[PDB]
Amino acid sequence: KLLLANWGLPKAVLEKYHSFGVKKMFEWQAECLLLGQVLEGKNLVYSAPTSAGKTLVAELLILKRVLEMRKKALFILPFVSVAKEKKYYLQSLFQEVGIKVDGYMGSTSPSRHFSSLDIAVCTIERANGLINRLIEENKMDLLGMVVVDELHMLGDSHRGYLLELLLTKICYITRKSASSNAVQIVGMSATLPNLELVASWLNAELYHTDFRPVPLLESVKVGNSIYDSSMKLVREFEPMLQVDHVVSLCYETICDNHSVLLFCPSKKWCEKLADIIAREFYNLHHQAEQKELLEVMDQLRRLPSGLDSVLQKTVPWGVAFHHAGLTFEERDIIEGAFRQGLIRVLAATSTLSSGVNLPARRVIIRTPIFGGRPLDILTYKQMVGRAGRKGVDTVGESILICKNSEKSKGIALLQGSLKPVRSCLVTGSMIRAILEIIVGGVASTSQDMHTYAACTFLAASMGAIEACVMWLLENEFIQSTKVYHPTHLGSATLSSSLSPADTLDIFADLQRAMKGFVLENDLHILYLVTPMFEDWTTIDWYRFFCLWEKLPTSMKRVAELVGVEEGFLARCVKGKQHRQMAIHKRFFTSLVLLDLISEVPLREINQKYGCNRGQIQSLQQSAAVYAGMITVFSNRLGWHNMELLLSQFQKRLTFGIQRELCDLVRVSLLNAQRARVLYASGFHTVADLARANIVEVEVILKNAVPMRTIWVTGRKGLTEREAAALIVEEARMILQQDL
Numbered sequence: 055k056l057l058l059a060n061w062g063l064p065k066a067v068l069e070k071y072h073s074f075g076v077k078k079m080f081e082w083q084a085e086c087l088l089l090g091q092v093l094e095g096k097n098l099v100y101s102a103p104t105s106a107g108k109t110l111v112a113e114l115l116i117l118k119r120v121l122e123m124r125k126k127a128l129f130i131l132p133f134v135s136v137a138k139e140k141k142y143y144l145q146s147l148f149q150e151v152g153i154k155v156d157g158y159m160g161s162t163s164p165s166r167h168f169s170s171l172d173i174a175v176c177t178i179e180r181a182n183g184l185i186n187r188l189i190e191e192n193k194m195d196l197l198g199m200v201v202v203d204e205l206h207m208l209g210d211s212h213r214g215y216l217l218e219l220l221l222t223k224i225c226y227i228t229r230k231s232a233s234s235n236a237v238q239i240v241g242m243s244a245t246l247p248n249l250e251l252v253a254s255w256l257n258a259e260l261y262h263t264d265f266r267p268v269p270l271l272e273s274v275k276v277g278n279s280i281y282d283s284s285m286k287l288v289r290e291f292e293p294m295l296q297v298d299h300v301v302s303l304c305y306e307t308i309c310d311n312h313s314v315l316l317f318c319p320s321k322k323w324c325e326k327l328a329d330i331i332a333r334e335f336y337n338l339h340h341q342a343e344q345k346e347l348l349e350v351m352d353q354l355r356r357l358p359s360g361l362d363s364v365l366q367k368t369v370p371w372g373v374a375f376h377h378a379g380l381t382f383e384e385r386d387i388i389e390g391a392f393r394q395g396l397i398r399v400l401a402a403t404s405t406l407s408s409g410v411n412l413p414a415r416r417v418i419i420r421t422p423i424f425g426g427r428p429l430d431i432l433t434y435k436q437m438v439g440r441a442g443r444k445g446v447d448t449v450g451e452s453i454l455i456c457k458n459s460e461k462s463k464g465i466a467l468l469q470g471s472l473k474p475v476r477s478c479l480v481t482g483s484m485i486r487a488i489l490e491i492i493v494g495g496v497a498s499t500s501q502d503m504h505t506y507a508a509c510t511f512l513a514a515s516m517g518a519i520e521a522c523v524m525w526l527l528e529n530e531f532i533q534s535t536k537v538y539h540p541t542h543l544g545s546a547t548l549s550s551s552l553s554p555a556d557t558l559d560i561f562a563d564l565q566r567a568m569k570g571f572v573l574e575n576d577l578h579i580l581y582l583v584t585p586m587f588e589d590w591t592t593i594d595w596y597r598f599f600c601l602w603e604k605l606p607t608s609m610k611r612v613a614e615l616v617g618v619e620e621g622f623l624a625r626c627v628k629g630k631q632h633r634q635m636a637i638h639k640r641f642f643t644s645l646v647l648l649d650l651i652s653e654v655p656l657r658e659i660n661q662k663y664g665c666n667r668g669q670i671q672s673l674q675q676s677a678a679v680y681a682g683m684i685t686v687f688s689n690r691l692g693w694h695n696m697e698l699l700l701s702q703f704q705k706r707l708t709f710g711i712q713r714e715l716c717d718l719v720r721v722s723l724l725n726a727q728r729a730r731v732l733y734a735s736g737f738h739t740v741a742d743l744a745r746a747n748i749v750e751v752e753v754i755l756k757n758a759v760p761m762r763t764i765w766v767t768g769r770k771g772l773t774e775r776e777a778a779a780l781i782v783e784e785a786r787m788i789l790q791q792d793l
């Protein structure tokens with residue numbers, strides 16, 4: 055029975071699955087897919103190692119709930135990078151059968167309407183908003199499927215509560231129409247202890263497996279000795295050519311024509327511990343594919359930030375580093391190079407662990423102490439689950455390097471297990487949930503309000519709702535007639551997907567901005583769409599004051615109209631208040647975005663502001679999301695003179711462009727530099743680019759360099775000719791299917 059052809063499956067999807075290598079399932083997937091009425095709608099909650107092909111069952115169930123019972127489906131993923139990878143994977147897997155798959159990730163939204171879509175690959179943040187939109191207009195009959203990758207995220211997380219709110223709201227809808235399902239829910243999780251609780255909460259069937267196609271050997275390293283998980287010595291390591299012996303371990307891994315993952319606790323540590331192995335691989339291997347590696351170097355060299363000095367020293371030896379400091383393009387290039395075997399040693403941080411699927415033969419975790427704290431058991435499991443490539447390696451090795459006292463934390467990580475899932479639900483999450491149900495009209499009376507809380511994970515794990523209702527009533531989010539009805543502010547909060555806690559100050563700030571606005575720059579329209587400071591960078595006070603001393607004769611007008619000062623503007627803090635700190639740290643943040651929408655090169659922004667390019671890109675993505683939310687908030691409040699101003703800044707921040715390119719960047723392959731060089735040559739509209747001379751745009755893309763040197767997000771590397779051919783084809787499709 056274990057064969058993808060025996061199971062009912064489209065021929066096109068079957069032949070696409072044979073391309074990636076999936077031709078015979080495992081026993082665990084069959085036992086999970088044949089777990090009673092799961093194929094009919096009984097929700098499904100299952101656990102498996104990430105290397106065991108967890109998502110195959112989810113994709114099969116989607117194809118089912120989409121083909122047989124034609125309806126929409128949601129694929130909720132934890133992060134934007136993995137969500138985009140899954141969106142492109144599902145697109146390449148489902149294009150032939152005609153299932154329109156599009157993504158709601160970060161700032162990007164599908165050009166086509168959600169009604170035209172058939173699968174929405176969403177982040178946790180945007181899937182909740184999508185379901186809120188479906189409930190408001192009441193199009194909840196379109197939804198028939200919801201898939202939640204990384205179900206364990208529903209516990210303690212900054213975006214996990216939105217996951218719980220996503221399901222307890224759906225279940226109520228299914229359990230209020232009952233006065234094998236109407237909306238199926240399929241969840242993928244890790245080896246959680248209380249998975250059962252989660253399975254019973256969602257009524258889902260529970261499937262737990264521990265099968266790993268490639269066996270895993272986790273071990274600790276103390277001094278020169280290697281011990282297994284159960285405090286048993288397994289090997290006496292002796293360095294081959296050593297000048298921790300981290301480099302010797304990497305050398306031993308490399309000698310057998312394999313690759314290695316090296317998880318370091320910081321960025322500078324990754325850059326240092328990739329330089330070191332590069333130096334030894336030169337000296338130890340030169341007594342002093344290439345072509346593919348030179349292609350990778352050239353791909354990295356035609357980027358807005360260009361080549362990196364440490365990357366330049368490391369990469370032409372098989373060794374490199376992959377941390378959050380690099381741009382998303384550089385990170386994807388390095389990840390692709392490692393995935394193809396071109397890069398053999400990858401010094402990465404913990405951020406990779408939870409990101410893309412990047413398996414390595416040996417995973418060396420330098421220290422059990424990550425960022426001054428012991429490594430998380432979930433983080434450790436995520437790292438060591440990458441040890442072993444399926445279908446290539448016979449085994450996989452994880453080596454955690456510990457010493458002295460550190461040995462204790464290492465053995466604790468070796469013998470530890472995942473903590474149980476939580477609920478995280480007065481509190482902001484419960485306020486959000488109460489507002490979501492009341493404003494959607496799904497629940498009106500307080501008896502219904504407690505009935506809703508009887509459907510949440512808190513009720514399954516085993517007052518607050520009254521406090522939440524009181525808070526929403528006292529803050530004019532909700533009116534009482536005691537039937538609770540949404541107000542205009544309460545409806546606008548649920549529409550623009552913002553926390554009701556933040557929406558109060560957002561309302562005050564926008565209302566103050568309407569009274570006095572500065573239209574002679576884009577800084578006032580940016581201070582409103584600037585999310586916060588958070589921790590996106592470590593602000594240098596002197597640098598800030600210097601920039602401020604050199605602002606146009608019109609910026610400081612915007613600075614003083616929003617709350618910034620000069621007596622406290624990188625002044626007092628220069629030689630050394632919770633709101634003024636949040637204003638200046640928002641002013642600086644709004645200055646950086648000012649250079650992002652002014653098309654300033656990332657390296658120049660880094661030099662003038664001191665923030666690296668990864669932080670700048672993260673900030674611009676967050677600001678674009680916030681701009682979209684603020685635009686919807688003003689749209690639903692009847693603020694036509696502010697929504698009109700904000701309607702373009704989401705795109706101008708997503709792509710970091712000027713207004714002129716806002717039509718060119720609609721093309722998927724025109725980010726902010728293949729559109730500026732294509733705009734200077736006379737193409738200023740997606741109309742002029744549909745018939746743009748093919749060979750002409752090839753020449754233009756060949757010029758202006760900061761074979762497949764051009765790198766495209768989701769398309770990896772593209773040759774100039776193929777790149778601009780796809781550019782003109784995308785322009786043709788955009789202008790042809792939008793009218």
Ligand SMILES: COc1ccccc1-c1ccncc1C(=O)Nc1nnc(OCc2ccc(Cl)cc2)s1
Binds near residue numbers: 181682
């Ligand atoms: C405020 O909405 C944003 C808009 C731009 C960019 C980011 C956000 C955002 C930010 C932070 N958290 C969440 C969101 C979010 O996506 N909320 C959404 N609500 N509705 C959407 O459209 C989906 C949709 C539309 C029509 C139908 Cl019939 C069905 C579904 S998206």
